[PDB]
Ligand binder design. Structure first.
Ligand SMILES: Nc1ncnc2c1ncn2[C@@H]1O[C@H](COP(=O)(O)OP(=O)(O)O)[C@@H](O)[C@H]1O
Ligand SMILES: [Zn+2]
Ligand SMILES: [Zn+2]
Lengths: 408, 229, 585
């Protein structure tokens, strides 16, 4: 019965044709030439090629994605034999994503799509994928591919087998932390954080502070009375309308574009044309340049408001928070160097120490609005100096040292 | 699995008994054992130079001789009992559980080794850093400075019990004596502390001096344990 | 099995088809017989030679160490144990029983990795890893073979042991302690003098920062060393290590233990450690004879800085250094030279320091553990001192940025460094003296950012006069604007919007061979100029003290090294006197 699923996959790789070419056969063949044992399957082609397997995969991927791994491995090895390990499945999709707050107890074991920003990552760890064992009582040998060792010999007492280390295979895995975009979070709420895991070629692609689009499986695992921690098996990560492009191109073609946008910034306030225009320059920011020696010029434009009280200077920062797509607003008093910049903390879910970003890390690639800048301590200012003039944050806590970029 | 080594304890033990009987001061050690026999002394110090002197005396006389000092050098753990065994039968419940005396060996002197045309590697004032794993179980002389000494602590060697059912003295919860093993009823054991074998023990540590330290390193330390008198 | 014996004979054939290996073993055997120190029972195998003799066996070491190396170890041990009769009366029973270990060299193929590049795909393979020694564990002996005597039966006995680390192949573990009774059941007489023990140590190797990308924690891996490699490295050393990358334990496979976070422990079974011309010389000496070589070398230095000829000359003189002396009373004389830079922060100070730090062979960057009087502990609790930049820069140069930002604890420690070239460590339970013969170049800035040229740094920067007097040369630079001149230097910046490799040989050779002594020519010059400076009551950068006389001797000696003359001349003192006047104005 499941052989048809393998056969359909084989047709979808070897025989699927788009743009008058065997794109899936060729791209897998090219990956074999590169020796990259992974294939990027586009879900939009899958639905157009065979909806029946899509129904099974979308509803019950429990056995389908084991079939995905074994079928692609067989097909790719067939291509390798024709031209002259387990191939990782990678999924690219453009279907609608479900909001992170909308995940519930109903999408369990269902493939879902998400979008968010990575706030913390873990170090790589090795996990078993193929094992060979030997009985200590009678030297009986067998191979094994959650997974647990047999309790009795197949030829010896309870648990007679031991692992043959030199004839076993392992794969690498990483643990990631994802949370929703703070801009999409209404005030009075801390963005929900979700644990994600990635393995093999999908590891180490994203650092904390990177905005990503997620395609994965929603599931739980034990780690309250029965509160199991949710987690995601990562399947694929990615990181305007034609009429909108013409609309904004027409905006670029407006003769009074600069003045219209200048007036548009905080229209409730009167005059103040110069400070409006500089903040407009803050929104666009400079263009990045790289020295031939490898150094990078900071492209951010940082402005200080240093005038008398009651001049709408606080209101100017607030308006930017509502116009900048990536916006973080914080006060000088209610901030700390660890809160602003990066920090190192132990994840209680996996019992490991993770590198975790801060407010100045979340605002990477956008604009941050700090108020009462004079009221924050010098140590916070010192950490800002590195971010302002190098776009980097250096962390040295406990017994570990690291440097993290921050284009804030 | 059985193996063969050129070591022969039969020749050495006979030499030890002969050395005890013959080596003069009458005999030096027999006089020492006589004082112990007179209950005047509690510890026995064995001089390896005296043993080496006797070996050279036997060597110059052309009689049979085996390098007893090197045998004690290599395996001092077992030769300590052998000297006790010789004394336990030659001094003017199993015996080892009741012995209250103590025995030690003093090292060869470099002048003596050179005088007998030999090298006393064990007695060479080497540092703790230079003591490899090859020296485990070997009597060696260490030159250094003591940096920490602990106070006196009890060190029980054999734990004594008394049984209500038989009255026997049991040494090491239930009595293992012959009468209680035969009987269906066994008297429960209790700790007879006044009968347990206490040994005087202190913890000491030795460390290299500054001149013994290689370039830019930290002076290493080694544990020294002191027992008996 | 029979396969094990086949590869033992195959390795014996390799040891015979190239006699260049086993003849060095014979050289070791001959040397060890004469010393009746001991040479190690280790040889280095060229993988290329092994590649051309047996491709499968050569690939066997790289790909399947567990099934190829132990056959090779036995074959080498067999060859050493049979090439001589070992006529030693007693040493033949203990010393000759130590097996012979292997080392590897040549092309590593794909197995040349880093802690970052090392992954699970590289397990169970012999690989070469490049990194830095962060720390070393404590050394302990490890039992290998036990020897005991069965007194009741009248014959000796023995027993071997296996460990998951020492056995590349998964042999049955032997957790048993040294036996007390053998098969006969009689109590055994322990033979410590004939048992075999081998030392063991653990080290941690981390990826070098030179290739580390930002935004990630560093990658590290543990390496296991035994016997001869047990104490061959110290923390902080760059190292290339070749060993078997092998896993241990189980990731919760026993019972249920099905947590998703548990992974398999991995480490490297290291077995080879690699710690990290006359034509030019005749050209170096020949170039010294032209009059402008001092100026030409002073222009190749700092090509990105226009002007500052005296500073560039000062850098050359500081690299050349003076000459140290010893006295019959037991005293020693400092010879090195220090330079200090002061003025506006971004103006050419970081640029000059960047060139010197990159050019100098033993340049260390410092900014405000340099005192080397602090300890770092191992994983088991034992601790070791960590070296400091001032100590490490012995016979080198110290590059300091943000010198004004250094703490008072650094200042009191560097007082003896710059004056006595030593560090007197006095801590709880630790007391030692370390040489600190390092030249010092530092940069400092005023608090206000804009330097008040009318006043000395004692009020613009407010460092203690005792600390400031320890610098032989001081320079103040500030971007006083001449628009046509600043245009000339900014055009090259706007363009972005003697060869150094031979010069470093010139600096190396001159200091390596030339040790100039004083001459009557400079004696009168030194006394007269020093007296004139003392007579000059006009304001200067610093008052005239005996250290100024010391600086003149140091500078004149440095110029003689530029001239590569082992005796000083009147011209050397003349240059030093003029340069000091420029630094004092
Ligand atoms: N030019 C202006 N046009 C309209 N409102 C203004 C203007 N200048 C100040 N305001 C008023 O000032 C207030 C913001 O002041 P704010 O910047 O918070 O004071 P502070 O500088 O003490 O933080 C707003 O309520 C705003 O209505
Ligand atoms: Zn079995
Ligand atoms: Zn009893």
């Amino acid at each position: 019965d499941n052989t048809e699923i393998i056969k359909s996959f084989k047709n979808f790789i070897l025989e699927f044709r788009l743009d008058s070419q065997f794109i899936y056969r060729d791209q897998l063949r090219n990956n074999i030439l590169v020796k990259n044992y992974s294939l990027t399957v586009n879900m939009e082609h899958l639905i157009g090629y065979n909806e029946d397997i899509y129904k099974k995969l979308s509803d019950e991927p429990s056995d389908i994605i084991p079939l995905f791994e074994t079928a692609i491995t067989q097909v790719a090895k067939r291509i390798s034999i024709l031209s002259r390990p387990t191939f990782q499945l990678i999924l690219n999709s453009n279907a609608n994503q479900i909001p992170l707050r909308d995940l519930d107890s109903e999408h369990v074991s269902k493939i879902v799509r998400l979008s968010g920003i990575i706030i913390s990552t873990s170090v790589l760890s090795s996990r078993a994928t193929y094992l060979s064992i030997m009985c200590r009582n009678c030297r009986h040998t067998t191979s094994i591919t959650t997974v647990s060792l047999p309790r009795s010999c197949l030829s010896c007492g309870p648990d007679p087998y031991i692992i043959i280390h030199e004839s076993s295979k392992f794969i690498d895995q990483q643990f990631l932390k994802l949370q929703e975009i703070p801009e999409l979070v209404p005030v009075g709420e801390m963005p929900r954080n979700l644990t994600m895991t990635c393995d093999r070629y999908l590891t180490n692609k994203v650092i904390p502070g990177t905005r990503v689009t997620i395609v994965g499986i929603y599931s739980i695992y034990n780690s309250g009375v029965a509160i199991r921690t949710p987690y995601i098996k990562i399947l694929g990560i990615q990181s305007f309308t034609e009429e909108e492009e013409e609309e904004f191109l027409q905006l670029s073609r407006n003769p009074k574009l600069y003045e219209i946008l200048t007036n548009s910034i905080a229209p409730s306030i009167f005059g103040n044309e110069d400070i409006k225009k500089a903040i407009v320059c803050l929104l666009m920011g400079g263009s990045k340049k790289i020295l031939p020696d490898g150094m990078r010029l900071r492209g951010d434009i940082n402005v200080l408001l240093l005038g008398d009280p009651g001049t709408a200077k606080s209101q100017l920062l607030k308006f930017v928070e509502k116009v900048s797509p990536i916006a973080v607003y914080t006060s000088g008093k209610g901030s700390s160097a660890a809160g602003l910049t990066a920090s190192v903390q132990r994840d209680p879910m996996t019992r490991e120490f993770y590198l975790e970003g801060g407010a100045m890390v979340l605002a990477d690639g956008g604009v941050v609005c700090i108020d009462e800048f004079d009221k924050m301590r010098d140590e916070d200012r010192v950490a800002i100096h590195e971010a302002m003039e190098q776009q980097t944050i250096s962390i040295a806590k406990a017994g570990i040292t690291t440097v993290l970029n921050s284009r804030t | 699995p059985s193996i063969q080594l050129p070591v022969d304890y039969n020749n050495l033990f006979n030499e030890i008994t002969d050395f005890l009987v013959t080596f003069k001061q009458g005999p030096k050690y027999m006089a020492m054992l006589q004082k112990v026999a007179n209950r005047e002394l509690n510890s026995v110090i064995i001089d390896l130079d005296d043993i080496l002197q006797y070996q050279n005396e036997k060597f110059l006389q052309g009689t049979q001789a085996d390098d007893l000092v090197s045998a004690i050098q290599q395996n001092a753990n077992h030769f300590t009992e052998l000297f006790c065994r010789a004394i336990d039968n030659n001094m003017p419940f199993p015996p080892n559980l009741t012995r209250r005396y103590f025995l030690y060996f003093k090292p060869l002197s470099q002048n003596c080794a050179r005088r007998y045309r030999k090298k006393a590697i064990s007695s060479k004032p080497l540092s703790v850093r230079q003591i490899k794993g090859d020296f485990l179980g070997q009597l060696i002389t260490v030159r250094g400075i003591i940096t920490r000494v602990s106070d006196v602590k009890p060190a029980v060697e054999v734990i004594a019990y008394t049984c209500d059912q038989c009255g026997y003295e049991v040494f090491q919860s239930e009595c293992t004596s012959e009468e209680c093993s035969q009987n269906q009823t066994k008297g429960q054991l209790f700790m007879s502390t006044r009968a347990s074998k206490f040994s005087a023990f202190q913890e000491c540590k030795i460390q290299e001096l500054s001149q013994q330290v290689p370039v830019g390193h930290i002076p290493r330390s080694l544990n020294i344990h002191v027992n008996g008198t | 099995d029979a396969v094990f014996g086949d590869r033992v004979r195959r390795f014996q054939e390799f040891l015979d088809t190239f006699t260049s290996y086993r003849d060095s073993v014979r050289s070791i055997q001959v040397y060890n017989s004469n010393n009746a120190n001991i040479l190690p029972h280790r040889i280095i195998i060229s993988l290329d030679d092994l590649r051309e003799f047996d491709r499968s066996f050569w690939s066997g070491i790289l790909v399947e160490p567990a099934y190829f190396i132990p056959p090779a170890e036995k074959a080498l041990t067999d060859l050493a144990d049979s090439m001589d009769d070992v006529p030693h009366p007693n040493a033949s029973a203990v010393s000759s029983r130590h097996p012979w270990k292997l080392s590897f060299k040549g092309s590593f193929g794909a197995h040349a990795l880093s802690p970052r590049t090392l992954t699970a795909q590289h397990l169970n393979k012999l690989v070469s890893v490049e990194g830095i020694v962060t720390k070393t564990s404590l050394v302990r002996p490890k039992l290998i073979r036990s020897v005991h005597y069965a007194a009741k039966t009248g014959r000796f006995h023995y027993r071997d042991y296996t460990d998951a680390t020492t056995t590349l192949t998964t042999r049955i573990p032997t957790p048993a302690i040294y036996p007390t009774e053998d098969t006969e059941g009689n109590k055994l007489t322990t033979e410590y003098g004939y048992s075999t023990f081998i030392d063991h140590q653990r080290i941690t190797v981390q990826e070098m920062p030179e290739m580390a990308p930002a935004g990630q924690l560093p990658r590290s891996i543990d390496v296991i060393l035994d016997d001869d490699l047990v104490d061959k490295t110290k923390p902080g050393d760059r190292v290339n290590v070749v060993g078997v990358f092998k896993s241990l334990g189980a990731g919760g496979m026993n019972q249920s233990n099905s947590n998703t976070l548990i992974g398999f422990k991995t480490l490297i079974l290291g077995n080879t450690v690699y710690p990290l011309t006359d034509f030019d010389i005749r050209n170096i000496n020949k170039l010294s004879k032209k009059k402008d070589i001092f100026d030409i070398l002073s222009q190749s230095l700092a090509p990105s800085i226009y002007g500052h000829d005296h500073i560039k000359k000062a850098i050359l003189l500081m690299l050349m250094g003076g000459v140290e002396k010893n006295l019959e009373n037991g005293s020693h004389l400092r010879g090195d030279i220090n330079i200090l830079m002061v003025g506006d922060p971004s103006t050419a100070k970081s640029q000059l320091l960047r060139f010197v730090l990159n050019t100098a062979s033993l340049a260390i960057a410092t900014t405000g553990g340099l005192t080397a009087a602090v300890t770092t502990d191992r994983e088991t609790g034992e601790r070791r001192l960590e070296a400091g930049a001032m100590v490490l820069a012995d016979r080198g140069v110290v590059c300091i940025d943000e010198f004004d930002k250094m703490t008072d604890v650094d200042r009191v420690a560097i007082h003896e460094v710059m004056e006595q070239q030593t560090v007197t460590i006095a801590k709880a339970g630790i007391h030692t003296t370390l040489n600190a013969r390092c030249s010092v170049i530092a940069a400092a800035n005023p608090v206000f950012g804009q330097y008040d040229v009318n006043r000395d740094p004692h009020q613009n920067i407010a460092l203690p006069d005792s600390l400031l007097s320890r610098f032989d040369l001081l320079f103040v630079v500030t971007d006083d604007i001449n628009e046509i001149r600043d245009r000339s230097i900014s055009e090259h910046v706007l363009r972005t919007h003697v060869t150094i490799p031979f010069l470093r040989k010139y600096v190396q050779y001159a200091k390596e061979r030339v040790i100039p002594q004083l001459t009557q020519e400079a004696i009168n010059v030194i006394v007269k100029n020093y007296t004139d400076l003392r007579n000059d009551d006009n304001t200067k950068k610093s008052p005239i003290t005996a250290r100024t006389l010391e600086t003149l001797i140091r500078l004149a000696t440095a110029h003689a090294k530029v001239r590569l003359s082992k005796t000083v001349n009147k011209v050397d003192a003349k240059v030093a006197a003029n340069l000091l006047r420029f630094a004092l104005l």
